[PDB]
Amino acid sequence: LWIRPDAPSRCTWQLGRPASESPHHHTAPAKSPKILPDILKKIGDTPMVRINKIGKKFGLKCELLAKCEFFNAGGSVKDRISLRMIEDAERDGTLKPGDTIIEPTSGNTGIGLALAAAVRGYRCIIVMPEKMSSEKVDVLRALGAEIVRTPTNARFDSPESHVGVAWRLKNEIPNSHILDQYRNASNPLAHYDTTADEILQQCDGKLDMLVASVGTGGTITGIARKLKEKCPGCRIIGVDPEGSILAEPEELNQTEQTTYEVEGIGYDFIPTVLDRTVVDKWFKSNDEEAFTFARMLIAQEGLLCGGSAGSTVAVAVKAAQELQEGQRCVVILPDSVRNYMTKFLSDRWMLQKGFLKEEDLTEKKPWWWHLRVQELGLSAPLTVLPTITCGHTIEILREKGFDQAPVVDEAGVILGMVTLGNMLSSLLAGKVQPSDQVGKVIYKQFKQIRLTDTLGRLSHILEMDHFALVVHEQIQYHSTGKSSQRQMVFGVVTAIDLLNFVAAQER
Amino acid sequence: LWIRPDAPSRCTWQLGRPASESPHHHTAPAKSPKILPDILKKIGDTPMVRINKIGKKFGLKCELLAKCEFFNAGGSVKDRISLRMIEDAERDGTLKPGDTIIEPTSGNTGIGLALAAAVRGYRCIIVMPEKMSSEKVDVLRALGAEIVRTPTNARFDSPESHVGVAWRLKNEIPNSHILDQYRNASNPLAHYDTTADEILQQCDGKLDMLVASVGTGGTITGIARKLKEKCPGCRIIGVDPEGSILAEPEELNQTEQTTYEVEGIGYDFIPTVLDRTVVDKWFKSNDEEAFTFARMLIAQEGLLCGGSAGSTVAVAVKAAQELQEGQRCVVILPDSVRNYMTKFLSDRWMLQKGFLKEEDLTEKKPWWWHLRVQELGLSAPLTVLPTITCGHTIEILREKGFDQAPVVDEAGVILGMVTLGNMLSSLLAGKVQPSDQVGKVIYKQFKQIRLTDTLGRLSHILEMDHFALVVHEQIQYHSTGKSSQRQMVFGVVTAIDLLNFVAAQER
Amino acid sequence: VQELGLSAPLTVLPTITCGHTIEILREKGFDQAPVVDEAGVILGMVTLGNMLSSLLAGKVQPSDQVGKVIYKQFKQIRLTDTLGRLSHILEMDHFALVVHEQIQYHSTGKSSQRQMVFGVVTAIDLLNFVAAQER
Ligand code: HEM
Ligand code: HEM
């Protein structure tokens, strides 16, 4: 009953055959009106961005271009797929309003279909492998679509795979569909009708190479067929993650790990729409190579593009090494960074998975990075209690000659810090009166830092909080049966003082 | 030495004066090139989207339109400001490459300037109040810009306010520019030259109303002056958060809360660029309405927009009640949802800050939501130890009619669960052999659930993990202190079984 | 002087028994700890090596309090003072107890004073610091 997704294609398209032989409907990429009837019309005509620093740094003689396909409605290149598939299904009459649309997804197809459903009222059921970020869940719950997860390492044909659950669901609930992104011909057709046309029109149809990731089979086949039909000289590369079976010939697939940390590319089967014959050479790329290039993309060109583009530019800085002056390289950037905010963008996760190493983290930092905070000029001869009046504090601080002081309880529990200037501004503004206690103007946000920690830790703490209260704590022993813990503020540091210290040491 | 940001405007503009009197260069928009020379050219000509369900539900007789200004490069409506200010500064010659650009910001001018700096090489320092989400800190770090935080509740005039820290830095770091978004005339001028032109051209200049947030002063003044000059009949409204001072007349500001949870609107002063007299009427909006309307925007129109796009439509569903058929309402949606993923999009945070009550989150749920999980048909008659061979397991399970079994160690620790269907596929694929132990096929991830928790908790657990292992644990006492713990797998439930139960009970 | 490896994570009260001290300092990996009264007034220092020798000599017993072996004399030094001042202090006294004192205000006149031991430095540590920094 169930239909495999890896079955060989029945398609009969072959290079050189005129489009008049196409059994499939072709949609005109007509320009959208001046007022989009709804968000779904903001899918198409994404910009073609020239990329400067990466191409120059790694010795690319040819102009390197990137097709930014992360400014679609949902933020991905799986938003042409949802629109095209829904349009075609409704046109052919296979679907009616109010139906339930099940769709196994590698990620962004889930978001695209959820958005289209929420706009047109369909009840959507998305099935995702368990490895996908939670940021692709929080953006689905808000859309209201149901979400079902499947085990990460289940082989596609087994019942627990992320297509086995989808097909079983389609049988339990009546009046439900599976648009089947793996097999539907509308998947690559969307690209063959819009993605290829836009590239050809923008680049004047004179591009001597292309790159593109894989994992659906659409972004590569749908573009390759048109490019070879109208731009025969284009060398159409591929990509794949080390651990997938899509890449050919078999020699490049000889690695064993069954899971990889790039979300959206590679698979353990050949999708039916994947027209491999159009590829001209397959590379591979591995997690760290992808993340350490996504970070540098963001940092050096402002292209806010996510993980699956790191691999796609990594492969470019190799495959195009043989190009010469006057030729153009075109790449595809599948998705926006919004789906990886807790992933590789987070230093913590990058170091935890070791795609960076600490020496890489420090080599790029100025000289003073390793100096211990103990070396700064910091002190706090005075302290204040929370019960004092603001009128009393304004005189105490000035008569002592200090502009700020910590606020501590009777025993040592730090509560916050108070500053003269803010207190005076509050008094003048009338928000508090001199008789009023300081409890209404005390700064309650701060973070402790201990003397040993390097200035690097201080600089990574000031990114969250203005005040870094240097403190020291002691355990006191009575008889091993009674003990107490105590701490005392030992001066505070702030970005102002840190930069002043760096300047003074430099000067 | 330091210059206040709230000083009265020195501008002499007044309705009806010819444009030839403008002392400021106007950057007339021109058709964008087919290949953007870099990302900074994807700033302008964002779509205009009619909004269907919100307008109809709340009795808006008029066409309600939205200007989606969250498809700019940085994902915000503060990306025209960053581009325009940098370009004008360079044109004036006040700036040279390699300089340090310090800018106090509410969070989105920060990202815009960080992008427009990392593209051109400037060393950017961004000062930002502590209240802004960490999801902007993460996106700033990747861009490599220095970041400095300031206390949340510091009065603007105090030295510890974000403007104060910005000016103190500028006064000490050599070769440093402070573009001062609050005072620069380019801030509103950018909108007056581009934002107004696009709205006028798209909407045919026949809009009888407008809405817009405030907090910078630019989005409203810049659009308002042009709309009044060329579309005199537009009824221009403002907005503001309860707790801010920008709103007029003063009678509306009589509230005492000094902090509000919307990021980027309102302030404790009147920015100089804010040309208030162009407003025709003001309102206020409070946190809960804004967040609820942001959620009900996302869930019902696919317009992915963040917190400040909630207030800007909650205000519309009131101010436009007086409109009639045939007239157009235009709103401004500042930012993209990428900056709030941990915030209101997260049910956890929403409930924690109580902007939703549990009954609100439970009313719309189907009937079975309150049933207890023990209501389901669930059992686990047998178990297997990890040391068993796959050959043994495939014969144990098939003979009894069962197809899956938990994996339990000798003591009782749950290790994982194995499915017969996946084991057979693994054997056929050659990844394992019958002599091999199950350690290579055991699913590693699952989540526990106890018999008392409702099916709602189960449905919120299945959004993260395929398997929900219904377990049970008992504490056992030998004699008082010599306690011990034990746990057993009672039954396993999956989305398939939950949906099947719902269907069977319904039928 | 703040450039040294000065530290003092723990402290003891004068009434503690010597057995408790010999066990605490060893189980915590340290060998010396300041003796601080309840109010925070520094009283002296106690060292594991001397206490163990005293136990073996019979001058004290494990149940005995540390009051009979506490070192009585020292001299305070504040973190701002140069190593020259520390060297001219160590010519008179073995222990230089680095401390910090704070005035705490309830309301102007109703003031109070507090202090704590931030670290202890001795000629051994000073010379070792010089040697390591040079090398
Ligand atoms: C000369 C033009 C074309 C010819 C002769 C052609 C022929 C066909 C035919 C007869 C089928 C139905 C096969 C079946 O139902 O068993 C088919 C399906 C399909 N075609 Fe085409 N078609 C053309 C255009 C295109 C184009 C432009 C694309 C993509 C760029 C495409 C991709 C596909 C795909 C993916 C399928 C479905 C394969 C499957 O479901 O296994 N076709 N084609
Ligand atoms: C008839 C057209 C205009 C006239 C007569 C005019 C006149 C002036 C003058 C003389 C100044 C300098 C004031 C000073 O340096 O103290 C100024 C600044 C300024 N103008 Fe215009 N200008 C025009 C166009 C515009 C437009 C189109 C905008 C916004 C849409 C604008 C907003 C501003 C702002 C924000 C300032 C800065 C005020 C300050 O920094 O204190 N002006 N204008």
Author numbering:
A (entry chain F), B (entry chain E): 42 to 548
C (entry chain G): 414 to 548
Question: What are the paper's exact sentences on this?
Answer:
Cystathionine beta-synthase (CBS) is an essential metabolic enzyme across all domains of life for the production of glutathione, cysteine, and hydrogen sulfide. Human CBS adopts a unique multi-domain structure: an N-terminal haem binding domain (residues 38–74), a central PLP-dependent catalytic domain (CD, residues 75–382), and a C-terminal regulatory domain (RD, residues 411–551)5,11,12. The RD adopts the evolutionarily conserved Bateman module, consisting of two tandem CBS motifs (CBS-1 and CBS-2) and a surface-exposed loop (residues 516–525) extending from a CBS-2 motif. Here we show using cryo-electron microscopy that full-length human CBS in the basal and SAM-bound activated states polymerises as filaments mediated by a conserved regulatory domain loop.
We pursued the cryo-EM structure of full-length CBS initially using two constructs: one where an N-terminal His-tag was removed during purification (CBSFL) and one with a permanent C-terminal His-tag (CBSFL-CHis). Micrographs of full-length CBS from both constructs in vitreous ice clearly showed the presence of flexible filaments of varying lengths agreeing with 2D classes. Multiple maps were processed using both helical and single particle reconstruction to resolutions of between 3.9 and 3.0 Å. Both constructs resulted in maps with virtually identical conformations, and both were used for modelling. The CBS filament adopts a left-handed helical architecture with a twist of −108° and a rise of 51 Å. In the basal state, CBS regulatory domains sterically block the catalytic domain active site, resulting in a low-activity filament with three CBS dimers per turn. The domain-swapped dimer, previously observed in crystal structures, is the repeating unit, and helical formation is driven by inter-dimeric RD interactions, i.e., between the RDs of neighbouring subunits of the filament. Here the RD sits atop the active site entrance of the catalytic domain hindering substrate access. Loop 516–525, a β-turn-β extension from the CBS-2 motif in the conserved Bateman module, plays a key role in driving oligomerisation. Though both full-length CBS constructs resulted in highly similar filament maps, one key difference was the observed protein degradation and the presence of slightly shorter oligomers of the CBSFL construct without a permanent His-tag. The CBSΔ516–525 protein, which does not form filaments, is less thermostable than CBSFL by ~5 °C, confirming that filamentation increases stability.
